[PDB]
Scaffold this active site. Sequence first.
Site, short mmCIF file in Angstrom:
data_model
loop_
_atom_site.label_atom_id
_atom_site.label_comp_id
_atom_site.label_asym_id
_atom_site.label_seq_id
_atom_site.Cartn_x
_atom_site.Cartn_y
_atom_site.Cartn_z
CG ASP A 229 -2.31 0.70 0.93
OD1 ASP A 229 -2.56 1.12 -0.22
OD2 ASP A 229 -3.14 0.82 1.87
CG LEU A 270 0.71 -3.38 3.82
CD1 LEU A 270 0.42 -1.90 3.68
CD2 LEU A 270 2.16 -3.63 4.16
CG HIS A 271 -6.50 -1.58 3.40
ND1 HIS A 271 -6.55 -1.53 2.03
CD2 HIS A 271 -7.54 -0.85 3.85
CE1 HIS A 271 -7.56 -0.77 1.66
NE2 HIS A 271 -8.19 -0.35 2.74
CG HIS A 284 -0.57 -16.19 6.68
ND1 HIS A 284 -0.60 -16.55 5.34
CD2 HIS A 284 -1.59 -15.31 6.84
CE1 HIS A 284 -1.58 -15.91 4.73
NE2 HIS A 284 -2.19 -15.15 5.62
#
Length: 305
Positions: A229, A270-271, A284
Amino acid sequence: PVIEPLFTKVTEDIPGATGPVFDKNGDFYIVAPFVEVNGKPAGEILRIDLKTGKKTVICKPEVNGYGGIPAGCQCDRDANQLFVADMRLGLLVVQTDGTFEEIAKKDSEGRRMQGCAYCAFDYEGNLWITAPAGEVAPADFTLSVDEKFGSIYCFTTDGQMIQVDTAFQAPAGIAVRHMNDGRPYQLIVAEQPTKKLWSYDIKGPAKIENKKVWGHIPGTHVGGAAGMDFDEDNNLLVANFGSSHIEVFGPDGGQPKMRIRCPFEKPVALHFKPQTKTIFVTEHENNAVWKFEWQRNGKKQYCET
């Protein structure tokens, strides 16, 4: 330079958690791609209460008895609906009531879609999509981890699903770098195991040229770039799966200008939360979702324009 921000847990017990997204009301979602029933895919799109981390199933996509593997998400602008890359079904459009539609079973050349993993809107409304999987269901699931059959698509505002490139080894995250005036300038594509970030120059809807290696992902671990991002300065944050780090690239790429050490080895997606400096990251090692504060706000997403 290497920074070590405080990571705060958001929610847990989500196998293969990825596809973090905020919708137009600020509701948060992630996808659980590894949910199965009797050994067969039954992946889920979840809504997350941000105060408690409690999980609510929004959508369990299945078509003609083939379950989906939802994997990456983007919110639309003209409607509060989610564009979801699915590794078994292609591109979905999911409503908050749990109903969904399959957008294109075939591409513009009439060829069956490949399963999709990440996607990114440019500000003109075209959806750029990585497709590391093989043919969508009902074909057997296959993955381009060792062989170069991953593809790149653009789903244009005119509703065309155009394959714009192929022969990637496990393409992963994708993002659009825009000029200051809003015009799309470069498309960035992670090719995970080769430790490369590729770029093209965007000339228009589904028109890309000047393919080049844009950035180099550190490390020799198993893994490499996953999700990515941009921040509001067009620095590109890239989860380096397997490395315990998120890499920070300048707007022109190259080598990382900084790294973010994570308290886990396996960051994936991701954000940014809109209008904030808060990045949500999935991983994970613990199958969990975390948040931490970045140096500046995220780049505005298509849905906020």
